[PDB]
A paper describes a structure:
Enteropathogenic *E. coli* (EPEC) O127:H6 encodes an additional, tripartite TA module, *hipBST*, for which the HipT toxin was shown to specifically target tryptophanyl-tRNA synthetase, TrpS. Surprisingly, the function as antitoxin has been taken over by the third protein, HipS, but the molecular details of how activity of HipT is controlled remain poorly understood. Here, we show that HipBST is markedly different from HipBA and that the unique HipS protein, which is homologous to the N-terminal subdomain of HipA, has evolved to function as antitoxin by breaking the kinase active site. We also show how auto-phosphorylation at two conserved sites in the kinase toxin serve to dually regulate binding of HipS and kinase activity.
To understand the individual roles of the two autophosphorylation positions, we next determined crystal structures of two HipBST complexes with HipT serine residues mutated to alanine individually: HipBST^S57A^ (2.4 Å, [Table tblS1]) and HipBST^S59A^ (3.4 Å). The phosphate groups on Ser57 (in S59A) and Ser59 (in S57A) are shown in orange and relevant nearby residues are highlighted. **b.** Close-up of the HipT active site as observed for the S57A mutant with relevant active site residues shown as sticks. In both structures, however, the Gly-rich loop maintains its outward conformation, incompatible with ATP binding, suggesting that HipT is inactive. The phosphate group on Ser59 occupies a position very similar to phosphorylated Ser150 in HipA_Ec_, despite the fact that this residue aligns to Ser57 at the sequence level ([Fig figS4], **top and 1b**). This position structurally overlaps with the γ phosphate of ATP in the structure of ATP-bound HipA_Ec_, suggesting that phosphorylation prevents nucleotide binding in the kinase active site ([Fig fig4]). Here, we observed a marked difference in migration between HipT from wildtype HipBST, HipBST^S59A^, and HipBST^S57A^ confirming that HipT^S57A^ is predominantly phosphorylated while HipT^S59A^ is only partially modified, consistent with the crystal structures. In summary, we conclude that the conformation of the HipT active site loop (Gly-rich loop) inside the HipBST complex is independent of the autophosphorylation state. We still don’t understand what controls whether HipT becomes modified at one or the other position but the structures of HipT^S57A^ and HipT^S59A^ could suggest that subtle changes in the loop can make a big difference ([Fig fig4]). Free HipT could then form three populations, non-phosphorylated HipT, HipT P-Ser57, and HipT P-Ser59. Furthermore, HipT P-Ser59 would readily be able to (re-)bind HipS, and therefore form a stable and inactive HipBST complex as well as tightly bind the *hipBST* promoter, effectively shutting down the kinase activity, halting the expression of new protein.
Residue numbers in the entry:
A (entry chain C): 2 to 339
B (entry chain B): 2 to 101
C (entry chain A): 38 to 107
D (entry chain D): 39 to 107
E (entry chain F): 2 to 338
F (entry chain E): 2 to 102
The structure:
């Protein structure tokens, strides 16, 4: 019924295939793409022993390098054009979650690299397993490398969460990161509105792991970099243990660095981030109050795209309801502001 | 300790060396192209530091890919740049770290 | 990427080309700068009669720097 | 090349240029048609002065206006 | 008694010397300057049998290179910091005329290099002879060379009067020359007002030999050249046949090039350049009518500086009278159209 | 017959030569400084002409200054390039024209 790349309804003929022609073309460039991998999971993905409970779900996730030889996906040792991300052995259905969240981001208007769900060749007569596939953004029109760098190295931060002190406190916030970006990329209100929305949407959707390595700079213009596309956007709401560890990967406001102050929302009857905290983030980026008010109204109107995308997805029903429950709650908190 | 050639866009841009005092990255005196990082401007040539530069440390892996590589190699716990040379021809962007 | 502005109209046209390549509409600019969509319209055609501060605020929101030379 | 930080910065630079050329406000009024009171407002903070008058004064002083990123 | 550099009245402590402390300092940089040359005229200037009567007065003028070695002027073979211009053997009192005209130009606000009159050592008990001295403008702070070029070579004109055709017509005018200058120097209202005034003052004062070699471009402020200071400004009014030969060295307007059209002033009961032709020159330079009107009124108000400077000068009484007569007539013509 | 070297601001910037076809001024292929004249731009290198370039002809002295020199060796205006070399170290500005030798 729904496309394994686009999540849009499949017409009469494409129903049995599971993929739409529009989707296959979006992901590969040709409608002749074969989204049924010619290899099995264990053929290329080794079973590494579990490390420690302390690391984020991304630490348990395998990553394969893929190249498109004709209309067939081929695993490469290095320098591929796509990356295959199978679900970790302990987190089943995580690839379906990253696919739903990344599809939602594209439908919301963000710059998201082309992606979809591909199935591995089965070992016997077991149910097909899907992995999330995404095109590498550090490639241009042809497979020529485009230079890029992660924000932790650019800002000269030694930890991706800003835990750079003598304690467990965080020393880099989204407010500081935005201030750094504004000074290195071209300023303009389009860049600022987008980056502000990325931070609000990581919070609304339950992506509490959008750290410094989840921001990049692409060197397309040559001298002046641009912000890299949205990548690794997953909702942690289906995993209660990981979801309650933090509201966001980094503190929202600069006043919160080193735990010196709480955000005004933490001092309210809500005791968590509210719309007022995001207005303060917007204000620090130079966005005008009348513009921030309109941006909040735009996010409220996008409720239908959020609900529909997750409900159309290949995520489990329990997982979808955990995400939409996080979303509805946090969306309601956006009204709590002056 | 060791010296490596840092390549950007397939061309040798500079060198990253290690010794008793620490690490040092330096662009070639005749390299007037784009900087490999906004943290390493081309206007400045020499970049000394006690620990491995945040740009070169950020190039190294972290989770599953660093773990799959570590179980088959098993090199020194704090072999900061030794791990970067092994994955030099497999980096993001247009950067390549090759042995000297 | 330095362009000498020949007439006020030349600047209005360059700012409008920049606005369109960024995908910014006139309403977004009105909310951010306070300049009305009708003044913004006059500005992008020929800012001769528009106040300097409004032209400077629009160039700023578009990421365009104003320079002086001889 | 000098990046213009604010409208006030431009009026001050145009006024410094006017004084180094030995041009008085009355000469500028006769040539541009802009009154000495508007010229006074312009050289202090051209924020509320029309763009065309700022552009005409920069022109008579031999100052070029450029745009960059 | 007036100063031989500034033409201002000498005070009690300067009266006997003939030079003021202000003037000696302006010209040399020190009040210890010796303006009484340690050499005679014939020691360094030779009398060669002349070309022919028909060459402009500048062709008959000797030029000596001078250097300032310890408050004393010394004649050098090449590249000095000052130039001595004695009166030509056939034009006595020409150095006193160039001094009066160049002093007037400085008093009028033009960029004029520092100058004065210096006396040669006398042969016997004859009255002292003076020569015009001027500091070279192609020098900076400590006589380092500043590059410059004349307008005829810059515009690629082979004759300094623009007589470049198959006939005897002039093909370059002040209007065309100004248009060329505006495209090569910094184009500003101060430069335009000054250049316009230089052309009007060459006409008012009787300098009918301000040709293409009498305009220069100096390469000082990096890349951007500037118009060179006023130099070689002499009134030809005391010499009737030279004065009558032309109103100006070049045609005033572009319409007059090749003799294709006359200036409107030539079609009027006046039959010469009038205020209306100079308004047309101003208009071509971008100067506004209200500004040109004010600029004319300033020229009328500068009448007192013109009269006074020539009357305070060391020029002969007959020569002053000829200059002021040219001046008064042409100043009256500025009111027309 | 003459390959005269032209030096601006103390250092040699190019060569001005004379032959059957006429005159030719050329800047050195490694000279990226300021032009000696607005009529001879730095961007263009070669400058051929049937007659002597208006810049080099304008450097030759006028009436008295040229008659004082043409009295010492007697130059009947036939060769204007040889007259330029007589006043080479006495030109206005920072231009100096010296022989190749």
């Amino acid at each position: 019924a729904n496309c394994r790349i686009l999540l849009t309804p499949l017409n009469e003929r494409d129903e049995q295939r599971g993929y739409s022609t529009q989707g296959l073309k979006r992901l590969s460039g040709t409608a002749k793409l074969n989204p049924r991998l010619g290899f099995t999971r264990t053929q290329f993905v080794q079973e590494l022993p579990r490390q420690q409970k302390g690391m984020a779900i991304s630490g348990y996730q395998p990553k394969l390098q893929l190249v498109l030889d004709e209309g067939e996906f081929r695993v490469v040792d290095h320098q591929g054009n796509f990356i295959l991300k199978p679900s970790p052995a302990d987190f089943p259905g995580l690839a379906e979650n990253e696919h739903a969240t990344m599809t939602l981001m594209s439908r919301l208007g963000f710059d998201v690299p082309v992606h979809g769900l591909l199935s591995f060749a089965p070992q016997s007569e077991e149910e097909l397993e899907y992995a999330f596939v995404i095109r590498r953004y550090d490639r241009d029109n042809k497979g020529l490398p485009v230079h890029q760098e992660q924000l932790d190295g650019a800002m000269q931060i030694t930890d991706k969460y800003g835990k750079t002190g003598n304690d467990n406190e965080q020393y880099v916030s989204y407010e500081t990161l935005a201030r750094f970006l504004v000074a290195h990329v071209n300023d303009n209100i389009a860049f600022k509105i987008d980056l502000f929305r990325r931070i609000v949407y990581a919070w609304l959707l339950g992506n509490n792991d959008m750290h410094l390595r989840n921001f990049g700079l692409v060197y397309s213009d040559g001298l002046t970099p641009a912000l890299a596309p949205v990548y690794d956007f997953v909702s942690v709401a289906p995993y209660p243990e990981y979801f309650y560890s933090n509201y966001l990967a980094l503190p929202l406001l600069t006043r919160e660095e080193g735990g010196r102050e709480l955000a005004p929302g933490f001092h309210s009857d809500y005791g968590e981030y509210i719309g007022q905290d995001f207005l303060l983030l917007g204000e620090s980026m130079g966005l005008a109050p009348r513009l921030l008010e309109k941006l909040f109204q735009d996010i409220r109107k996008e409720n239908a795209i959020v609900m529909e995308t997750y409900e159309q997805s290949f995520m489990t029903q329990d997982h979808i309801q955990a995400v939409l429950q996080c979303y509805r709650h946090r969306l309601g908190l956006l009204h709590h502001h002056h | 300790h060791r010296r490596v050639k840092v390549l950007l866009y397939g061309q040798v841009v500079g060198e990253l060396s290690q010794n008793d005092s620490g690490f040092l990255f330096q662009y070639a005196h005749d390299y007037h192209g784009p900087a490999i990082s906004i943290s390493l401007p081309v206007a400045q040539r020499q970049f000394p530091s006690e620990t491995l530069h945040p740009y070169f440390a950020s190039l190294a892996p972290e989770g599953w890919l660093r773990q799959r590589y570590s179980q088959i190699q098993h090199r020194d716990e704090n072999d900061l740049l030794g791990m970067l040379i092994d994955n030099g021809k497999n980096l993001l962007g247009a950067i390549q770290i090759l042995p000297w | 990427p330095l362009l000498t502005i020949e007439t006020p109209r030349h600047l209005g046209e360059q700012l409008n080309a920049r606005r369109k390549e960024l995908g910014i509409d006139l309403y977004t600019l009105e909310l951010q700068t306070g300049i009305s969509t009708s003044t913004l319209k006059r500005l992008f055609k020929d800012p001769e009669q528009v106040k300097f501060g409004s032209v400077f605020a629009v160039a700023n929101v578009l990421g365009v720097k104003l320079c002086i030379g001889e």
